[PDB]
């Protein structure tokens, strides 16, 4: 059995029912090498796929690319090949003053500022994680020594106007998004990223377990350019955490 | 010193309470209060019956909401004006999944916003989700009771009849929006219908208040067989014992 | 035959009534019923208190709705199942036009649908409008009482607080949708805010039921946000006199 | 001094504060001639304008054309010239089986299946007549001896798909409108026409008094295209009614 | 053999025409027809004046639409019933960009759907775009006339006044939706406002009909100068010369 | 200057003001090698960037990844670095029986079944190409000897439910998209892809020139699995066409 984009077969996954799904293809090997017997399976487009073993059980690691549309393809095709649980790891920009660079966030629900979520459920449906996955992610994050925040994430189909960035080619933000960062701040929203609304809505409406954990790389109330050593430490911690969360899900 | 407009209570009446248990039915308020220590009647106006009690030495409010988001929104707002920050919704519910049995408990992880009042706090994109600590406490209390507990999505409707795709009605009509909707939600894994959680969860999650919802299952629309009086009585009693234990877990 | 699910009454209990007066507050049910002949208590459950009475020799029902469209929709549906076809709503309201005074009466000619339950009966395009006969009877009854009467559009909100653009609240915030909305409605000639007419009028106008709404003004929102208590009793008393006389005109 | 489209001045109206607004420019003179001293004022595009006198008071008669957009121009420009009350007469298709050709409908509210109404008020706002105008129209219609219905009207920006007609070039109706006639019928809606949502919303949100009376020329439970044999008498009856309603509105 | 309900013409009346030129103003119909061979008046009913003529030996229809999408939609449908497949809209227009000068021509490449009738043919997601051959023919005809031609997006409004963000009106009010909208469109590069293209282009593009729009600019919302009478006369004449030449290119 | 995702500077582009933007990073080198002096600039995530020279002028080639979100980042960042004209090439699935595998499509407008377009303009705004770019693409495609179709494209945030595919993990399509392929077919829509609505809306509302040309790899009325030699030939012709369209756009 084959799929249209990922370039892997059911047999290639060696019975895996859990996937770790970072955004960046270059991070796939970095996650896989935290586990046993990592093996490269395929690379096509933004999709790099490895298998590995965790406590004797097969796990797949597959990049999503940026955004809900490319994420939706990876999740669907992995589900066709038997995957049922999806652990998203990535980076994020915090919007609350009390959330520091280097902290971790586990999303309890997403503001659906995307389009692909609507291809699975109407807007009324909540973009919420599986409770076991969120619970595992919180525990793994705390156990790493991180400062961890549970809360709502704004999930945008753009990096620029949908996150109310003005330092752009046009310097304009469409009416819908003018004032939106302050609005989300006042509503207690923690952070922005670009895939969770799609992932969580798709999975919660399709009988798949999903959750999202992220390391804070910037705070929008502070500066846009991360410090390199701090960012490296955050990224390394994030992938250690997601692997430990996977271990908890497989127990 | 103010007395809130609908609930008819003052901040002093609450004796420092920062947590409320919020059932729908005014007649259930005294029953819940009497599970705790030193229950005291505070007021009854309209659908709002208000008691205070003590739980491990700390003051707790019990306040009914009435049916629906609009009346719930008033109770939550007025209690928040008087210092309440945590809201635990309890009740009983039907279920729409064949695997969910009478006597099981549901703790809502998110709600389908089939209401109107949620939109008065946040646009539709915003998730109707509980506070994680409250949901965690509710799951623990429910599981410790010995019940089978389901974590998942609840469809929260502004109507009992067409928004829950009921056809046994005066007109027998369901508007286009809701035709086929029960099967749609079933296929999406939604556990149950109720009528307040979308408003409650959206209001609180967007206003700096902690909220969650737990419910005992008293009927299942997919199932033919009828539950006996004993099982229903036990389920109602367990639901309120569970919410009180969840309140205990929330106390600091 | 059947007992309806929430109201706890049967068709036989209504003694042939085809008209209901539907106040919000359960405590006001007896007060309306006693303005008519042979009032009898039928049932009380949750926010629903139900009496029967007789008006010019014809049976009438008085049934509270609770606050908001969701609880109203249940009462209207269940009364319609038992043969009620005409629904007269009485309540209180906040005026938003400077010339409308406390104690005046408003008869709604159409409602701004700032609710959710109306959408469970008809899409947003559908007008939340009263039955013309009911509105005509309410105008006449209100005028014949010596009241100052206004006919016009009502903004009907699922919340008391943000959807009526109140800021003296726990968060002190109003969601984008509702920021500037009071001024917008004022400029459009809207008379008043309340919380049930959009649901009631849309439900009934799309379901073969006759409905209308009359309300007593208890606050002018150009003046302040929270209603005064000193003028509320007199306003409430005249309102219920008016609705009973409107019912008499409908039974003729 | 002279409004942009209608080609008349305030002085031309001789103090009129009430207008009768039929759709067809050819019916303007007919309505004006039911009153005293009719005077032709202007004709441009779909806008033919007369004045006349009714019980000694100046009245305007001004055609609207078909649809909310052209209606909105006429109402605005008449309002700029001092008109405050607008009485709309036209033809309509009934959708209830009991409503017959030649009956008269007075709209109590309109289903807003237009676009121009949204240029005055958001969709939540009711497309409702002024109560005094509706009262006058009911009284005039009933006093005439006509069979009169009060109720909801579906007001469509199209004659064809928005009234769920299939005897058309494509023979198709967009998803929104598929099954719509039966839905409106089940909801008790009386009839279809094409201007009331715009007129009533515009006026109710702008401090103008408006209402609509219509003569039934077809029953849509019977067929799609109106029979010609009964057009003339229905139209004649309708305009006598609207003139009597105008008489009732004069102060 | 039928006579269409509004236009009052039969298929035989059109003498095989498969292309129509569709101005807004009935008085412009004869003026366009006389640029062609053997013009003949067919009918005038309401805002619909219909002529036939011959262009390079092929029959052409000229039919006015009236103002707005609703009346336009009737004319297009009824002509399509009688075999017309290509529709060329002409007129004159204002502009909202400083670089678009009086006497210039605009050929619409897409329309902002600020109408209602387009939604009766396709949901809002669908693009209001012309047939590429028609747009290409219109550009060429416009260039060949010596005019400066602009290709771009047109904002197509169901109103002349608030939907074009005009405040010089009876109320002086523009609903929230349209407040700030002219600057919004200007900053997005939109060239002009008119009142029929969104309906026409959406209807035709979703119905297997070829359509496009060309216009003369009669006002610029950004220039204080008042255009000279001769310039306006020249522009009107040029616009209809251009649309006839575009029809010639479509028939070749 | 520098950008957040693409890893290139303005200097790296050597004055280029036109970009060719395929979806698949592997296609970038292929396109660049059709031109003179191709130079690899960077590869990060789904973004591979080359420069080349066409008739002596610098051209950039930059992949977008799948979907509007990742496309929107590339377009913004290239615009920050001076690019003003964007020529999209890719593959597509036809939905019309008369549009054969191997044909080419030049989009005249897109059905906005995405989310990112709404981050630039409200839904009313048309997802429309620049007329010069569309003209150049039609000319290049026809001059190649291809069979070329001009028309409307449905641009979806998903490959699966938003293109009404049922051979999936759940086998379900959300109500919004049930019956949608037939609806688009009846409306004359030619094809499905996943980036044009975002690209065209973004550019048309931001002062950037854009257009889209695509080779038909599948017909949804036929089979899902393409024949390899046919697909190879279609892909090769598509990139030759887009380079010739670029030549036509140079000033
Ligand atoms: N600010 C941001 C940092 C990382 N990812 C985002 O989507 N946004
Ligand atoms: N079926 C239901 C039982 C209880 N509450 C509801 O809202 N629905
Ligand atoms: N201001 C108000 C008074 C009474 N009822 C309302 O809903 N609002
Ligand atoms: N059926 C109809 C007759 C007259 N006017 C309409 O809009 N519809
Ligand atoms: N400003 C305008 C001139 C002509 N037509 C319009 O619709 N708008
Ligand atoms: N069927 C398809 C082929 C290629 N791309 C798409 O989005 N769809
Ligand atoms: Cl007051
Ligand atoms: Cl008939
Ligand atoms: Mg700090
Ligand atoms: Mg800090
Ligand atoms: Mg704002
Ligand atoms: Mg009491
Ligand atoms: Mg919170
Ligand atoms: Mg405060
Ligand atoms: Mg073939
Ligand atoms: Na991507
Ligand atoms: Na209630
Ligand atoms: Na017209």
mmCIF file of C-alpha atoms in Angstrom, chain A residues 3-5 23-25 44-47 64-70 72-73 76-77 79-80 83-84 91 113-122 155-163 165 167-170 172-174 176-177 194 205-208 224-225, chain F residues 3-5 23-25 44-47 64-70 72-73 76-77 79-80 83-84 88 91 113-116 118-122 156-163 165 167-170 172-174 176-177 194-195 205-208 224-225:
data_model
loop_
_atom_site.group_PDB
_atom_site.id
_atom_site.type_symbol
_atom_site.label_atom_id
_atom_site.label_comp_id
_atom_site.label_asym_id
_atom_site.label_seq_id
_atom_site.Cartn_x
_atom_site.Cartn_y
_atom_site.Cartn_z
ATOM 1 C CA UNK A 3 0.421 7.030 -0.749
ATOM 2 C CA UNK A 4 0.514 9.963 -3.140
ATOM 3 C CA UNK A 5 3.048 12.339 -1.477
ATOM 4 C CA UNK A 23 7.582 21.241 10.588
ATOM 5 C CA UNK A 24 11.123 21.432 9.247
ATOM 6 C CA UNK A 25 12.398 18.406 7.266
ATOM 7 C CA UNK A 44 9.818 14.107 -1.259
ATOM 8 C CA UNK A 45 8.927 17.785 -1.327
ATOM 9 C CA UNK A 46 8.709 19.065 2.292
ATOM 10 C CA UNK A 47 8.195 15.510 3.600
ATOM 11 C CA UNK A 64 4.811 18.591 7.709
ATOM 12 C CA UNK A 65 6.109 21.699 6.020
ATOM 13 C CA UNK A 66 4.706 25.090 6.957
ATOM 14 C CA UNK A 67 0.937 25.438 7.194
ATOM 15 C CA UNK A 68 -2.249 23.492 7.492
ATOM 16 C CA UNK A 69 -2.449 22.387 3.833
ATOM 17 C CA UNK A 70 0.859 20.518 3.753
ATOM 18 C CA UNK A 72 -3.141 17.831 6.261
ATOM 19 C CA UNK A 73 -1.562 15.738 3.506
ATOM 20 C CA UNK A 76 -3.941 11.831 6.081
ATOM 21 C CA UNK A 77 -1.314 9.708 4.354
ATOM 22 C CA UNK A 79 -3.292 7.625 8.839
ATOM 23 C CA UNK A 80 -3.808 5.617 5.621
ATOM 24 C CA UNK A 83 -0.793 5.930 12.276
ATOM 25 C CA UNK A 84 -3.341 6.950 14.923
ATOM 26 C CA UNK A 91 8.644 26.742 17.584
ATOM 27 C CA UNK A 113 -7.208 31.492 11.845
ATOM 28 C CA UNK A 114 -6.554 28.910 9.110
ATOM 29 C CA UNK A 115 -8.506 27.472 6.195
ATOM 30 C CA UNK A 116 -7.802 23.756 6.181
ATOM 31 C CA UNK A 117 -9.577 23.132 9.502
ATOM 32 C CA UNK A 118 -12.851 24.037 7.694
ATOM 33 C CA UNK A 119 -12.230 21.167 5.288
ATOM 34 C CA UNK A 120 -12.792 18.784 8.233
ATOM 35 C CA UNK A 121 -15.330 20.509 10.501
ATOM 36 C CA UNK A 122 -17.331 23.759 10.463
ATOM 37 C CA UNK A 155 -3.080 29.366 14.599
ATOM 38 C CA UNK A 156 -2.641 31.456 11.474
ATOM 39 C CA UNK A 157 -2.450 30.670 7.761
ATOM 40 C CA UNK A 158 0.116 33.462 7.430
ATOM 41 C CA UNK A 159 3.303 34.437 9.227
ATOM 42 C CA UNK A 160 2.887 38.125 8.408
ATOM 43 C CA UNK A 161 -0.594 39.801 8.345
ATOM 44 C CA UNK A 162 -2.426 37.049 10.280
ATOM 45 C CA UNK A 163 0.097 37.500 13.097
ATOM 46 C CA UNK A 165 3.190 41.995 11.564
ATOM 47 C CA UNK A 167 7.280 45.338 8.990
ATOM 48 C CA UNK A 168 6.463 44.005 5.554
ATOM 49 C CA UNK A 169 6.520 44.875 1.872
ATOM 50 C CA UNK A 170 3.176 46.710 1.978
ATOM 51 C CA UNK A 172 -0.642 46.867 5.630
ATOM 52 C CA UNK A 173 -2.769 44.400 7.554
ATOM 53 C CA UNK A 174 -6.264 43.575 6.278
ATOM 54 C CA UNK A 176 -9.931 41.353 9.832
ATOM 55 C CA UNK A 177 -6.494 41.282 11.504
ATOM 56 C CA UNK A 194 0.703 28.078 11.817
ATOM 57 C CA UNK A 205 -12.989 15.077 13.991
ATOM 58 C CA UNK A 206 -11.379 11.953 12.437
ATOM 59 C CA UNK A 207 -10.721 9.585 15.316
ATOM 60 C CA UNK A 208 -7.014 10.435 15.585
ATOM 61 C CA UNK A 224 11.965 39.564 16.596
ATOM 62 C CA UNK A 225 15.582 38.334 16.311
ATOM 63 C CA UNK F 3 14.585 37.750 5.521
ATOM 64 C CA UNK F 4 13.281 35.294 8.114
ATOM 65 C CA UNK F 5 12.797 32.046 6.054
ATOM 66 C CA UNK F 23 5.850 24.108 -5.590
ATOM 67 C CA UNK F 24 8.338 21.270 -5.373
ATOM 68 C CA UNK F 25 11.882 22.227 -4.226
ATOM 69 C CA UNK F 44 15.929 25.908 3.968
ATOM 70 C CA UNK F 45 12.751 23.997 4.793
ATOM 71 C CA UNK F 46 10.581 23.798 1.616
ATOM 72 C CA UNK F 47 12.404 26.799 0.126
ATOM 73 C CA UNK F 64 6.795 27.536 -2.377
ATOM 74 C CA UNK F 65 5.975 24.228 -0.743
ATOM 75 C CA UNK F 66 2.386 22.973 -0.766
ATOM 76 C CA UNK F 67 -0.341 25.398 0.196
ATOM 77 C CA UNK F 68 -1.131 29.047 0.625
ATOM 78 C CA UNK F 69 0.622 29.487 3.993
ATOM 79 C CA UNK F 70 4.091 28.484 2.815
ATOM 80 C CA UNK F 72 2.607 33.473 1.291
ATOM 81 C CA UNK F 73 5.929 33.504 3.164
ATOM 82 C CA UNK F 76 6.369 38.237 0.943
ATOM 83 C CA UNK F 77 10.073 37.651 1.507
ATOM 84 C CA UNK F 79 8.936 41.061 -2.422
ATOM 85 C CA UNK F 80 10.982 42.431 0.506
ATOM 86 C CA UNK F 83 10.700 40.909 -6.640
ATOM 87 C CA UNK F 84 7.562 42.333 -8.229
ATOM 88 C CA UNK F 88 3.626 30.112 -10.751
ATOM 89 C CA UNK F 91 0.683 20.393 -11.708
ATOM 90 C CA UNK F 113 -11.248 27.409 -1.046
ATOM 91 C CA UNK F 114 -8.188 28.418 1.023
ATOM 92 C CA UNK F 115 -7.601 30.438 4.180
ATOM 93 C CA UNK F 116 -4.567 32.579 3.509
ATOM 94 C CA UNK F 118 -8.490 36.087 3.605
ATOM 95 C CA UNK F 119 -5.349 37.380 5.342
ATOM 96 C CA UNK F 120 -4.930 39.822 2.413
ATOM 97 C CA UNK F 121 -8.444 40.654 1.232
ATOM 98 C CA UNK F 122 -12.024 39.806 2.252
ATOM 99 C CA UNK F 156 -8.150 24.191 -2.055
ATOM 100 C CA UNK F 157 -6.381 24.165 1.318
ATOM 101 C CA UNK F 158 -6.565 20.341 1.211
ATOM 102 C CA UNK F 159 -5.703 17.660 -1.303
ATOM 103 C CA UNK F 160 -8.316 15.252 0.070
ATOM 104 C CA UNK F 161 -11.715 16.525 1.382
ATOM 105 C CA UNK F 162 -11.580 19.952 -0.268
ATOM 106 C CA UNK F 163 -11.093 18.213 -3.612
ATOM 107 C CA UNK F 165 -11.745 12.680 -2.519
ATOM 108 C CA UNK F 167 -10.654 7.137 -0.880
ATOM 109 C CA UNK F 168 -9.259 8.236 2.449
ATOM 110 C CA UNK F 169 -8.748 7.129 6.017
ATOM 111 C CA UNK F 170 -12.236 8.194 7.144
ATOM 112 C CA UNK F 172 -15.910 11.202 4.819
ATOM 113 C CA UNK F 173 -16.131 14.690 3.377
ATOM 114 C CA UNK F 174 -17.487 17.559 5.511
ATOM 115 C CA UNK F 176 -19.333 22.106 2.886
ATOM 116 C CA UNK F 177 -17.533 19.935 0.319
ATOM 117 C CA UNK F 194 -3.698 24.287 -3.772
ATOM 118 C CA UNK F 195 -1.874 27.662 -4.051
ATOM 119 C CA UNK F 205 -4.171 43.303 -3.420
ATOM 120 C CA UNK F 206 -0.452 44.169 -2.808
ATOM 121 C CA UNK F 207 0.778 45.722 -6.047
ATOM 122 C CA UNK F 208 2.545 42.565 -7.278
ATOM 123 C CA UNK F 224 -5.848 8.854 -10.091
ATOM 124 C CA UNK F 225 -2.492 7.208 -10.980
#
